Write a protein that binds this ligand. Sequence first.
Ligand SMILES: [Ca+2]
Ligand SMILES: [Ca+2]
Ligand SMILES: [Ca+2]
Ligand SMILES: [Ca+2]
Ligand SMILES: [Ca+2]
Lengths: 396, 5
Amino acid sequence: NRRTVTLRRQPVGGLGLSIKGGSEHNVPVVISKIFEDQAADQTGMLFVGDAVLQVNGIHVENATHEEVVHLLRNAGDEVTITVEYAYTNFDAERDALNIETAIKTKGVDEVTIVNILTNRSNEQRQDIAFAYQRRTKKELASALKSALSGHLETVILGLLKTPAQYDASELKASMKGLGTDEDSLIEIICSRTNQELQEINRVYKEMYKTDLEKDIISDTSGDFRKLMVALAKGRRAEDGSVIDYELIDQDARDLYDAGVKRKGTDVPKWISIMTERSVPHLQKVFDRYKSYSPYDMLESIRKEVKGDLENAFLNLVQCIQNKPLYFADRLYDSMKGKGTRDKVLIRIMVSRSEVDMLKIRSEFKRKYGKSLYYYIQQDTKGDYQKALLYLCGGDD
Amino acid sequence: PSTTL
Ligand SMILES: [Ca+2]
Ligand SMILES: [Ca+2]
Ligand SMILES: [Ca+2]
Ligand SMILES: [Ca+2]
Ligand SMILES: [Ca+2]
């Protein structure tokens, strides 16, 4: 049903149609509406559900939504459209072929590379990497490493790793050398779940020929070391349909009796409770803690401990209470001031794009008035900005 | 996700 139709742009409705879809959602652009008696309806050959393949002979079978909207608005008074009424290995090969063409183009076509990779799931990017190596005999990561540069290179190479590989390599990078990036180490260890950590530990073993727990011990000290080792084990309790109200109250008293009530801090009891109890349980514990203590769990942490141990406890409680808001706040910090903390911004957008990016955007918009898309737009430029915007998934 | 033209 490959039909080629010429529409005449008219003041009453323009082209007289609506379109939905686009390669940013990995779907073909499809005619959404056809306003009756207007241009698209007058032709008699356009129907709701037609996939848009060409605009004035310009191929758009793999174009984004804005690219097709931009073509249809600049095609003149006479617009000619060619229409026709599960991710497979074919899609991987076509994606891998287009990425190969964009890399071999003189000057590198970064737009095409960003259009595809930032709009595929992590599992689909592995299928693309498998097909790219079959067709070119080259590794896609190393090909893009020399073809790209700057922040865009950091995003694309990070997107190519599996969730465990990316987390493991980021963990290794935070402890590399004498200067341990405690903030990056804290962000990953406090926010990852049991299933994610068990996979990180397994992959960290393969990539670096040593245990993650053994490397944490070598770069951390004191109670901060005990907190990261216990969290990195990923043996937190899994909650069921059992709300143990008696334990919620006793855990709150124990947290209060171990900190604000006594001189000093019984941090082993803090580490024991906050790392072993399930997340839904600890959420109700922290509210029950407000009934016994004049300060909430976060303020009690600021009053009891200092240094990296304070920073880790502050991040853990935020992840337990509201993890999407936790990432929304860290994204805002990465862009609020002069310049950009690109390491945090890139890592969050890469690691959370497929997890809870919608809930992060919802918390961000509610608290900061503007969208996460908007702040990314004002802090980054170029294809690096477009890649982050695609990982954001849309405005608001 | 639709745009009218
Ligand atoms: Ca270029
Ligand atoms: Ca490079
Ligand atoms: Ca170190
Ligand atoms: Ca105290
Ligand atoms: Ca900024």
